Design a protein around this ligand. Sequence first.
Ligand SMILES: [Mg+2]
Ligand SMILES: [Mg+2]
Ligand SMILES: [Mg+2]
Length: 801
Amino acid sequence: AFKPPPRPDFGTSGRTIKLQANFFEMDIPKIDIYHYELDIKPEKCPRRVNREIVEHMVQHFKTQIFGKPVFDGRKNLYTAMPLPIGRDKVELEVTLPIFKVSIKWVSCVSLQALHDALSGRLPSVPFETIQALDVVMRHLPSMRYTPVGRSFFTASEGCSNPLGGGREVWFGFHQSVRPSLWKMMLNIDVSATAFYKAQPVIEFVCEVLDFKSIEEQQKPLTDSQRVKFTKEIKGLKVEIKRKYRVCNVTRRPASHQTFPLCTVAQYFKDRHKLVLRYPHLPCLQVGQEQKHTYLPLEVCNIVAGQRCIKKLTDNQTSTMIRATARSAPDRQEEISKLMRSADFNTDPYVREFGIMVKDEMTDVTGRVLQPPSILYGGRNKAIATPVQGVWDMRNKQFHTGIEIKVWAIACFAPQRQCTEVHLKSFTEQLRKISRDAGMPIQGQPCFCKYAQGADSVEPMFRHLKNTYAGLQLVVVILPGKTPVYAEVKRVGDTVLGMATQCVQMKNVQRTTPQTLSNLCLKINVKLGGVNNILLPQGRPPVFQQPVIFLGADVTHPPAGDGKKPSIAAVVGSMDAHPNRYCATVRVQQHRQEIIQDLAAMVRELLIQFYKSTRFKPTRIIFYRDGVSEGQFQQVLHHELLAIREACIKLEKDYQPGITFIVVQKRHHTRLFCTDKNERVGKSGNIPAGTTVDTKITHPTEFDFYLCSHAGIQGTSRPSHYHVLWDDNRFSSDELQILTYQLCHTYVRCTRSVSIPAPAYYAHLVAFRARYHLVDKEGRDHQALAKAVQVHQDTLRTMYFA
RNA sequence: UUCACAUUGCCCAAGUCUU
RNA sequence: CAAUGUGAA
Ligand SMILES: [Mg+2]
Ligand SMILES: [Mg+2]
Ligand SMILES: [Mg+2]
C-alpha cells in the first residue's frame, strides 16, 4: 500500500512527433557536498531577513570560516567543500542594519548517489539530494528577485504594465529541479502576476479614488472615499530606512488627528521641521493596532515587491489577460529567450557547486495516439471520427435519446426583454435541433410563466411537481448573473429532486444551431439518455471483464479564505460503455487534500454500479485529480486503503484489482512542436493525442504526459498521469490508450477534453456543491453536509452536467 | 446560466518579525 | 465554478 510500481514498458502506439520541452539538461559533478544546520535567534524573522543575516554572517566571518555557501532561508546551509567544523557547533554573533547564529554539521550529500538513482543502479531517488540542488539553484534569485512559490518575479526593465488601482503586472519565471530518465533537468516556464507599484502613497490614493491629480480636492475625503482607500491600503507595507505595515487609516485629517506624547501635522512641524502639503488628508496607522503610530500620506511610499493577493477587478483582469496572452510559439520563444539571458552558469553559487545548465530546450519524441471512433444511434447508427480532437453531431442521433413528453418553462427574465415571441421562437428552434438529435420534444410545454425573484422559485417548482404527472424537465430562463440560479439548483437538486436546465436570456433571444445542439447534449444526459459510446470493438481489453471507472477531486476555497470547507467529489461509471456516471460529494476540513470519507463514497458507488449493471467490478480504475508530488504518499496511503476498505466491508474476499492514477493539469511542463508544419491552428499547439513517456518522465516509475485536447488559444497544458498503484499490471500502451479514449466520453461536448471524463465530472460535482453552499459557508459540519446532500430522486442522476 | 480551450483563484510550495 | 479572453455546426 506504498511503493509505486515500476514502469512496465514503454508505449509503442501512434505515429512519432518531434517535440521540445521546457526542461533544460543539467550536468552535476560526482562529489559530496556538506550539509549544516543553522539556528538564528530570534527565529521569528521572515525568510528573506534570515537570508540577509546569513549573507552578512558569511562576509563578516570570511577569515577562519567560509574564506560560497548556499542557504534555504531557514535552517539548511550547504557548501561545496567542508568547513573548519567537525560536528562541533559554532556560536556566531552577527550584526546588521543583533542576532546569534548557531551552526551544526549534519551530513554529507553525495551527488554520486544521485547519478546512480538516475540510472537503474539505485531503487529510488534520494529526496535530500534533490533538495540540496534546489537550494543551490534558488540561492541567488531568492535575494535578487521576489520569490512567489517556486517562481521569481521582478519589475521588467524598460516597460510598465499598469493595471490601475496602484497595481501593475510583474513578469517572472518558475524554476524547479527534476530527475528524469535522461539527466537532472531544470524546468523553467515564464509567468506574470500582479504587484503593487512602488509609488508615493499620495499617488496610490489618486489611482484608487480615480483622481487625475491630488488637489481635486483640498477638502477631506468623504467617508465613502475614505473607506474605499482604507480597504485598499490596509495590510500593505509602506516606507518612510523604515518599513511598516498599515493597520488602519485615521478618520480625522493630519491637521486634526491627535496622539499623546498633539496633532500629527504639528508633531511633524516641530520635530521634523516638515510643513505638510495636504493637511486635510488622513494619516496611515502603522505597526501595532493598539498603539498610536500615525504617518501622514505625504511621507510614505508603498514598498517595492509586494504581490497583490486580493482579487483583480474585471477591468484589471482584462488588462492582465491582454498583457500576458501568448501563442505556443510565442511562449516557446519567451522561455528560450529567458534562458539565454538568465545565464545560470555564471551564477557564482551554481558555479561554486560545479553545475552546468544547457541553454537549449530538451528534444523529446512524442507519439500521437489514434482517437477512438464514436458510435451514435437512431436508425443510421452513425460513426463519428475525431479529427484534431473535434467532431460534431450533424446528421447523427443519440445512442439512446430521451423522448420528452412533459416539460415546462419558467422565465425569470423580464417580459419586456424576453418576450413571448422570443420564448416561442426559442422553443421552435430547440425542438427542431432536438428532433435532429434523436431527442424529440413532442409538443409545447405544459406550463410557461414569467416569475421574478428568488422567492418565487420554490413555490413555482412545488406547484409544477404537484400538478404535472410525468414532468421530465423545467427549462429556466435567466436574465444574466443572478442569485436565482443558485436558488433553482438548491430547490431542483436538493429540496425537490427535479431536472432543471438553465439558459441565459441572450441565448433565447438569439439562437444558433451550435448552442442549441450543445444544450441538447446536456438535456439528454440529465434525463437519463446516452449521447454516444466508444466504438465497442475499438476499446482496450480491460473492458472484457466488469470494470468501474472512478474520478475524484477536492476543490479548496479561494486565496485568503480562512473558514470555508474543502469539497471532495467522487464519481463512478455505471455502465460498460462507459458513459453514464453517478456522483458522491462531501464537505471536509478546510484545505485538506486527502478525501476523508472516501471509503463510504466508494461503497455507495459500488452498490449503484451493481444495481445498474448486475456485475461486481473485477477492476477499479481510480483517476485522482490534482495531487502534487509532495503529497503522493500521504494521499495514496489513506485513499488506497479506503478503496480496499469499501470492498472488504461489502463482501468476502471481494478484492478487485485497483489502479490508482494521479492526474495533474496544473504543473509547469510545456511541450512544443519542433517542426513548424506540425503546429495546429492559430495557437500553434501540439495535436490532440500527443503522448510523452520518455526522456523527461520519471527515472523508475510509471508516468506519462498526454495532451488529449485540441489547443484553441495560448499554450496547451499537457495533462500528466502518474500511476501510484497498479494491481492490474497495465502495459503503457493499454493505459495510455484507455486514458485517451476516456477523454472522448465527456457528454457536454463533441470534443476530446483535457482530462478523462470521470475526473472532469468530479470537478463539476464539486463546483455544484460550492453553488449549493453560497453564503452558507460538529453542528457546523452537519449544517454544511446537509446543504450539499442531493434529493433521493437526484442521487442516481447526472444532475451536475 | 450552450460548450471547450486559455490566464488567475485550490494540496505541496510560497507567505508571516518614535507617533 | 467565478472574473477575462479565444473560439465552435
Ligand atoms: Mg482539486
Ligand atoms: Mg505549507
Ligand atoms: Mg468563463
